[PDB]
């Protein structure tokens, strides 16, 4: 399991540097331990000696239904909890709609295709609609009020705030059972904030660390990690376990394709976006 | 020569990978590098008369794509015990270049106690891009890679095992170090084209193969 | 016969320039004598004055069975020793297999279609297999150990090294009787080393000099010179005496065609590649 980074402070790292590591997004001794010097050195106010002391002392201690049956079959029954699933597609393909649907379906009983856990929606694009969550809840006969009470929401204004919310998510996810973490327009802040060309490596490093934190949180809490990508990077490939390509069919009916999964076939399924739901295509 | 399990690929390699040498397969993502690695991780355990090396497998992962169930599928393909295959495959995911090289020190001592025949390093070049991302640190990753390659060659000559490393093509030092360079490209559907793009011993030639649930296996139109 | 280049140094060419000519691949007074100025001038570290002194003082002094019966009939009995025979064909046609077979058949008695001489394998492609030589030896009832003892082998690492091996070959071929010289993938190193377009004339010049050295060695030792060319230069046409086109018949059975010989007809013969041998097709 995890080894929360608090224990690293008893090794004699000072607590301020541990706070800087938590701000960076390292929350376990496992997390600090299996990384090279440069990760800790790149943090502001950390020299090579402090990074070597951290690594040295760290080595001492150490299926959610989509609600579309065709899509569930495409996924062999739904998202695997504990792993990151990326859905990349054009704008208006229904990524946000799928997120809203899953934010409620996660709360469904496991026998009903849920995870019996609360949902987490981190929004960067303003598209969060509690009324859509209410619609999905009424679709499955779930209490809309309890759905909104079991979904904690916060809009990230920048990449630093986007990573900082993970610090609150890790501590908050310990007290209550969650099953779904949603990050909508996850890549948008890396394009709007970091727009220059010399700063590309900085946003790539921040994204890499963010993805590693996502995988860490997935393995730590056994929750589903959902991130949304606008396709107007090869780094996500090794990190994402299931890549879904979304494209528009005219009207409100969307085509979904699987474009990489080591376990799931590359395959396609047709679905629609209905007021209640993300739901099977009904010609 | 460890059988690839594709007859056309075996013919392409003149019977399969030469043990004791490094074979590089460079190609785009999704060409099937990982699938081939998973297949070979089991086929190495096959009898030599069946195209195997009769040795255990070593999977050093840097990309998360390791699937024991794929090993089980390959084992059932050749009628091998999936449990014994997993018992003859030691697995560890390398998080960085320093950990990637550090695992070779444990690998050399562990490979003495048991007979191994195959060492797999998947996304071998990915950690030199993710870790060393700056431009002033390029010489540092090149030095680390050079030392890593020398350690690989040393282990290959020491234990007579096959050294398999995977390279993503979005270094010229590996050319002299790698014995067989394979260029992999996608054919549409699930059928992949393999080309030999450098080998001091193998001809430049091409072979068509497919990626099947059981196996890496010949194309059957 | 030959007039080894050693005597040229007594004419008063300095010995260093003779060593440069030998590195270039000129080993006889015949070799220095019948070449124009530009050949010697193009050599590194040789001026026009030294080349003129060399030419001036130089003017003062100056059937091996294939083991396929059908192929032997095609060739009228086998390779002519003392001449270059080129076999151009696609990859996997069996050029290397034929080379391995001939490397042993050359040692066969002349009455058995051999040359009663040792073999020389210069490899550029890695395909050298002593076990194939052992198989051919056991086929014809020759001692496999004696076959390997009568085959001197060396792998050329580059075009310059490929030409440099001829210097050791010429001196070594004087002490022992050889009958066959094999250069396998002779043109491959000219494609891998010289890959640019501005350097094409350089590889063409080096190849021309190498071929001239081959003809010189053939006339010098009366041995058969076999070089293999992969067809995935027009200069070789005049140099090679017999041109064989090889193409695959499906399975392991290969079609051979004669595509140029001033003396042998253009004609075809079918043969197979068998574990023991390169040997006639036997339906």
Curated annotation (Swiss-Prot), chains A, C:
It holds the Pfam family HHH_5. Changing residue 112 to Q: In BC; decreased ATPase activity in the presence of stoichiometric ss-DNA concentrations with respect to RAD51; 3 to 4-fold decrease of affinity for ATP. A motif (Nuclear export signal) lies at residues 207-222. It comes from the Eukaryota. One of its GO terms (cellular component) is lateral element. There is a cross-link at residues 38, 44 (Glycyl lysine isopeptide (Lys-Gly) (interchain with G-Cter in ubiquitin)). Keywords: Acetylation, ATP-binding, Chromosome, Cytoplasm, Cytoskeleton, Disease variant, DNA damage, DNA recombination, DNA repair, DNA-binding, Fanconi anemia, Isopeptide bond, Mitochondrion, Nucleotide-binding, Nucleus, Phosphoprotein, Ubl conjugation. GO terms for biological process: cellular response to camptothecin; cellular response to cisplatin; cellular response to gamma radiation; cellular response to hydroxyurea; cellular response to ionizing radiation; chromosome organization involved in meiotic cell cycle; DNA damage response; DNA recombinase assembly. Highly expressed in testis and thymus, followed by small intestine, placenta, colon, pancreas and ovary. Weakly expressed in breast. One of its GO terms (molecular function) is enzyme binding. Residues 28-57 form the HhH domain. The modification Phosphotyrosine is found at residue 34. Its main location: nucleus. Changing residue 154 to P: In MRMV2; uncertain significance. InterPro entries: AAA+_ATPase, DNA_recomb/repair_Rad51, DNA_recomb/repair_Rad51_C, DNA_recomb/repair_RecA-like, DNA_repair_Rad51/TF_NusA_a-hlx, P-loop_NTPase, RecA_ATP-bd, RecA_monomer-monomer_interface. CDD domains: Rad51. It is linked to Breast cancer: A common malignancy originating from breast epithelial tissue. Breast neoplasms can be distinguished by their histologic pattern. Invasive ductal carcinoma is by far the most common type. Breast cancer is etiologically and genetically heterogeneous. Important genetic factors have been indicated by familial occurrence and bilateral involvement. Mutations at more than one locus can be involved in different families or even in the same case. Belongs to the RecA family. RAD51 subfamily. Plays an important role in homologous strand exchange, a key step in DNA repair through homologous recombination (HR). Binds to single-stranded DNA in an ATP-dependent manner to form nucleoprotein filaments which are essential for the homology search and strand exchange. Catalyzes the recognition of homology and strand exchange between homologous DNA partners to form a joint molecule between a processed DNA break and the repair template. Recruited to resolve stalled replication forks during replication stress. NCBIfam families: PRK04301.1, recomb_RAD51. Forms linear homooligomers, giving rise to a RAD51 nucleoprotein filament, which is essential for strand-pairing reactions during DNA recombination. Interacts with BRCA1 and either directly or indirectly with p53. Interacts with XRCC3, RAD54L and RAD54B. Interacts with the BCDX2 subcomplex RAD51C:RAD51B. Component of the homologous recombination repair (HR) complex composed of ERCC5/XPG, BRCA2, PALB2, DSS1 and RAD51. Interacts directly with PALB2 which may serve as a scaffold for a HR complex containing PALB2, BRCA2, RAD51C, RAD51 and XRCC3. Interacts with RAD51AP1 and RAD51AP2. This is DNA repair protein RAD51 homolog 1. It comes from Homo sapiens. The gene is RAD51.
